[PDB]
Amino acid sequence: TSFGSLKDEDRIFTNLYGRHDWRLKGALRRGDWYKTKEILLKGPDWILGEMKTSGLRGRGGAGFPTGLKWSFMNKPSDGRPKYLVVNADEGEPGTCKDREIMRHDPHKLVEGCLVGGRAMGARAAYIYIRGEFYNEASNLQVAIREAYEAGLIGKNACGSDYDFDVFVVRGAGAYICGEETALIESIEGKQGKPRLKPPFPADVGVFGCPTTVANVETVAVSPTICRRGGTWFAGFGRERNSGTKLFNISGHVNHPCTVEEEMSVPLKELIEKHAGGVTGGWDNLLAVIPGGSSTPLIPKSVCETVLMDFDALVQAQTGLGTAAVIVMDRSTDIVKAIARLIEFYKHESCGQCTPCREGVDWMNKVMARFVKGDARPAEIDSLWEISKQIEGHTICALGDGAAWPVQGLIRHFRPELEDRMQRFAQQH
Amino acid sequence: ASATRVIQKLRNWASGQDLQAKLQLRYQEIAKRTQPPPKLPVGPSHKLSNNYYCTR
Ligand SMILES: Cc1cc2nc3c(=O)[nH]c(=O)nc-3n(C[C@H](O)[C@H](O)[C@H](O)COP(=O)(O)O)c2cc1C
Numbered sequence: 481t482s483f484g485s486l487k488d489e490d491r492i493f494t495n496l497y498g499r500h501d502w503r504l505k506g507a508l509r510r511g512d513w514y515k516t517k518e519i520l521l522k523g524p525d526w527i528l529g530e531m532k533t534s535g536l537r538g539r540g541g542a543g544f545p546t547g548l549k550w551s552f553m554n555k556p557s558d559g560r561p562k563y564l565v566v567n568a569d570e571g572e573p574g575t576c577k578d579r580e581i582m583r584h585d586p587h588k589l590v591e592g593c594l595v596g597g598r599a600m601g602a603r604a605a606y607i608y609i610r611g612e613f614y615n616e617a618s619n620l621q622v623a624i625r626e627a628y629e630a631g632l633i634g635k636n637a638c639g640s641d642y643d644f645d646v647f648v649v650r651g652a653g654a655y656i657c658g659e660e661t662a663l664i665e666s667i668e669g670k671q672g673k674p675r676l677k678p679p680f681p682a683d684v685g686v687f688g689c690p691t692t693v694a695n696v697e698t699v700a701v702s703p704t705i706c707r708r709g710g711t712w713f714a715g716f717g718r719e720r721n722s723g724t725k726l727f728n729i730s731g732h733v734n735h736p737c738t739v740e741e742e743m744s745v746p747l748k749e750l751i752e753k754h755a756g757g758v759t760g761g762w763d764n765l766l767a768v769i770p771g772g773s774s775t776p777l778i779p780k781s782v783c784e785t786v787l788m789d790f791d792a793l794v795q796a797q798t799g800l801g802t803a804a805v806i807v808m809d810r811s812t813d814i815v816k817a818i819a820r821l822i823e824f825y826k827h828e829s830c831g832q833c834t835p836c837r838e839g840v841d842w843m844n845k846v847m848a849r850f851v852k853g854d855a856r857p858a859e860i861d862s863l864w865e866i867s868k869q870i871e872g873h874t875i876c877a878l879g880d881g882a883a884w885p886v887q888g889l890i891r892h893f894r895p896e897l898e899d900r901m902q903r904f905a906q907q908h
Numbered sequence: 909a910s911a912t913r914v915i916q917k918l919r920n921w922a923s924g925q926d927l928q929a930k931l932q933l934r935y936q937e938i939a940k941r942t943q944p945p946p947k948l949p950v951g952p953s954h955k956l957s958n959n960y961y962c963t964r
């Protein structure tokens with residue numbers, strides 16, 4: 481099928497553009513908090529089977545089947561309680577989606593946290609967001625005030641005897657904290673530094689207590705899945721890439737935007753249908769960044785005719801991540817762009833891994849030289865070898881995030897660099 | 909070389925060979941000293957890639 485071409489009756493995250501109210505009242509109107517009690521009765525196993533049938537995958541980073549990620553924790557308890565955590569953080573360049581989800585749809589997020597905690601026999605949900613989003617944390621705390629005062633949360637969840645709690649947290653302005661482990665550590669107060677897998681948060685972690693992590697979009701859609709059927713949902717996506725998705729189109733475009741869409745949709749259709757069209761004319765387009773900084777670019781030859789999903793991007797040698805589609809044209813120093821993208825990491829790498837701490841800066845300096853061509857070619861292959869050295873020899877995916885962009889830039893746009901270098905030599 | 913023609917002829921008749929052509933002493937038949945500052949090469953191991961020690 482020609483995927484996409486969606487219906488605003490199936491599009492989930494309504495009120496996206498805040499044209500309606502975001503309080504409990506408008507939420508109940510939209511269709512929030514419907515027979516949650518019957519769901520809590522049905523219990524965990526049914527919910528997990530529903531998600532597995534749906535075949536959903538994850539949004540944040542690589543696609544890890546949520547059904548299995550949560551069955552990891554589905555288990556009795558040994559005094560050690562069990563917690564859930566929500567990664568409201570959003571710093572990955574090109575992502576302006578969880579912020580909207582929160583300031584315009586917080587009740588649904590709370591509902592999803594509740595359903596997930598019930599699935600995992602939890603006790604509470606810690607929603608960790610950044611610090612700059614004071615307004616969003618405020619709106620969300622207000623919605624939680626309303627929820628508590630009503631009775632949809634707390635001792636008596638909605639009529640059952642399930643005791644659940646919600647707590648909110650702000651970071652202090654870091655990005656790495658959006659990692660499954662240093663998030664937990666920042667919560668606990670220890671520096672925002674990750675841990676080693678194994679062990680896994682699903683058995684050992686926060687406060688030495690088992691816990692699970694989840695992205696806001698996943699937790700917010702899981703309830704709609706549970707109350708709509710799952711199979712219907714999966715019908716809106718390919719075998720593995722099932723589901724709708726949020727996209728954030730930015731860069732060289734007439735009208736940047738945030739959008740809801742279907743998975744496995746053509747990127748060309750996406751850009752030219754919404755956004756009012758690409759700037760300056762399609763032909764002026766040079767390359768893309770379909771997954772933010774955590775993915776490498778791709779030029780015209782594949783920006784056209786491609787699909788959009790974890791698979792068929794992997795095949796294209798790349799990933800998807802957050803669906804942060806940046807677009808450029810023939811008017812920018814790709815090298816300066818990517819050098820700033822890497823200085824981002826050089827500023828926001830925690831530092832405890834030697835290759836990260838001492839190779840990201842190497843890369844930044846070598847790319848700042850590439851900017852002006854004050855170098856010589858074989859440094860290209862040197863940098864490629866450095867990237868292949870870094871990739872797997874770290875802890876958090878940020879190593880791959882710092883390597884991949886360079887790998888793509890150098891697998892695609894070498895002649896630009898070579899010509900920069902010869903031209904600079906000419907200029908002496 | 910500063911010596912005389914007749915003595916050249918005499919020593920040459922004595923020996924049998926010629927000597928003004930294959931003297932042992934050194935009259936500016938050498939390479940000047942104070943040679944210029946040179947620049948040197950390196951090996952095939954001063955590359956930047958495909959030089960992993962595990963190979964060699
Ligand atoms: C370095 C790094 C930064 C991340 N930053 C964010 C972020 O800012 N916002 C977000 O929603 N996810 C972010 N993620 C995605 C996380 O991996 C995700 O919250 C979690 O690890 C996996 O959850 P999921 O399987 O439900 O997607 C980040 C991941 C990494 C590795």
Ligand code: SF4
Pocket residue numbers: 656673674828829830831832833834836837874875876877878879
């Ligand atoms: S790879 Fe870098 S950012 Fe990630 S834990 Fe190691 S030092 Fe920190």
